[PDB]
Amino acid sequence: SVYDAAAQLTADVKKDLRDSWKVIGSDKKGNGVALMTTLFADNQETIGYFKRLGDVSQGMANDKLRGHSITLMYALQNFIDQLDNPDDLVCVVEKFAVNHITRKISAAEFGKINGPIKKVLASKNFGDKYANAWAKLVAVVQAAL
Amino acid sequence: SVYDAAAQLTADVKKDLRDSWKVIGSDKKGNGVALMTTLFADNQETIGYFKRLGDVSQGMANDKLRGHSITLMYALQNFIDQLDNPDDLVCVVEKFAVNHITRKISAAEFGKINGPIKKVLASKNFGDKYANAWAKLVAVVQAAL
Ligand code: HEM
Numbered sequence: 367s368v369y370d371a372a373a374q375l376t377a378d379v380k381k382d383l384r385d386s387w388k389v390i391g392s393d394k395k396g397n398g399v400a401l402m403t404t405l406f407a408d409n410q411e412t413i414g415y416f417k418r419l420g421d422v423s424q425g426m427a428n429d430k431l432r433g434h435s436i437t438l439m440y441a442l443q444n445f446i447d448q449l450d451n452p453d454d455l456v457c458v459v460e461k462f463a464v465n466h467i468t469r470k471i472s473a474a475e476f477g478k479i480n481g482p483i484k485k486v487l488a489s490k491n492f493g494d495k496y497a498n499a500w501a502k503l504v505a506v507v508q509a510a511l
Numbered sequence: 512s513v514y515d516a517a518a519q520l521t522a523d524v525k526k527d528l529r530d531s532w533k534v535i536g537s538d539k540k541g542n543g544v545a546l547m548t549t550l551f552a553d554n555q556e557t558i559g560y561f562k563r564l565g566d567v568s569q570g571m572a573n574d575k576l577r578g579h580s581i582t583l584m585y586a587l588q589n590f591i592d593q594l595d596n597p598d599d600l601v602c603v604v605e606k607f608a609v610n611h612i613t614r615k616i617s618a619a620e621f622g623k624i625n626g627p628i629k630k631v632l633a634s635k636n637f638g639d640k641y642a643n644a645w646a647k648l649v650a651v652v653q654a655a656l
């Protein structure tokens with residue numbers, strides 16, 4: 367259940383999420399596109415879900431991909447900002463879950479984002495400790511799908 | 512067409528947008544809900560588009576409405592952050608427009624948000640000057656619908 371998953375966000379997990387986001391969230395356009403390009407490269411099977419974006423291999427040059435990527439980073443920003451209040455984190459998570467549920471994105475499918483996050487984190491000197499913290503946040507979303 | 516609308520965003524308009532956002536965007540939950548509840552109060556017909564939110568009369572206490580309202584404010588945060596780069600502003604606005612186009616929301620219907628914005632701004636003491644600046648930002652979105 368999403369309510370139980372949200373309870374997994376302990377003090378130190380929230381702290382690691384904030385400290386890493388301070389760096390990653392500094393460049394939403396660059397890191398956003400990096401996150402999406404890595405997902406498509408590591409999991410080509412997911413490209414089909416993004417037909418609306420057009421040629422995803424163009425990266426930054428693709429306006430729709432860039433617009434999508436920047437927006438994705440504001441969803442993460444939203445989550446980080448709601449860490450203080452579990453009640454608000456949950457309602458924002460379920461809200462965001464609806465859009466993915468509508469596109470028939472399962473919890474297992476959503477979980478594929480963990481790889482790309484771990485890689486982007488690593489490129490900024492944030493190791494496993496941080497990747498695992500982010501995995502916990504992603505898990506909250508998975509519980510709502 | 513969206514680029515042309517974005518041209519109306521002059522240096523003075525962008526300055527008023529940023530200054531007012533510094534206050535309005537500081538309480539996303541509070542002001543986001545105030546915006547939505549004012550829209551419903553002044554234009555009851557718009558409630559027809561929000562059946563998914565349920566009992567919108569509960570206001571802040573309604574989790575779905577609260578979740579939706581906080582998220583709406585991050586859309587504005589996104590727009591405000593992209594003001595200095597027309598290319599990025601445009602791709603984000605177009606991305607956002609897709610969701611409202613799919614829900615058959617016309618430019619005229621979308622423009623009904625201008626009244627609520629003016630009232631929320633006035634509640635924080637930002638006069639007509641600021642309301643006019645925000646109406647121009649809204650116009651960029653309308654150009655995409
Ligand atoms: C960190 C995790 C993720 C975040 C925060 C995220 C965020 C978002 C946001 C904010 C949108 C745009 C608003 C909307 O249309 O609902 C979106 C759209 C979408 N997401 Fe995700 N997402 C994530 C992971 C995934 C994954 C792993 C998949 C599936 C492989 C997925 C599939 C989709 C699809 C298909 C769209 C529609 C794109 C379009 O046609 O414009 N998302 N996502």
Ligand code: HEM
Pocket residue numbers: 465557560561563564579582583584586587607610611614616620621622623624649
């Ligand atoms: C400043 C103006 C506005 C902003 C920033 C805004 C923002 C948003 C965002 C971010 C979403 C959720 C993500 C998505 O699914 O696309 C959304 C959904 C929606 N918006 Fe807007 N919106 C605005 C004005 C309006 C107006 C005036 C209407 C029309 C009466 C409208 C109708 C809708 C509808 C029907 C949904 C889906 C709600 C749901 O089922 O949860 N929006 N809007």
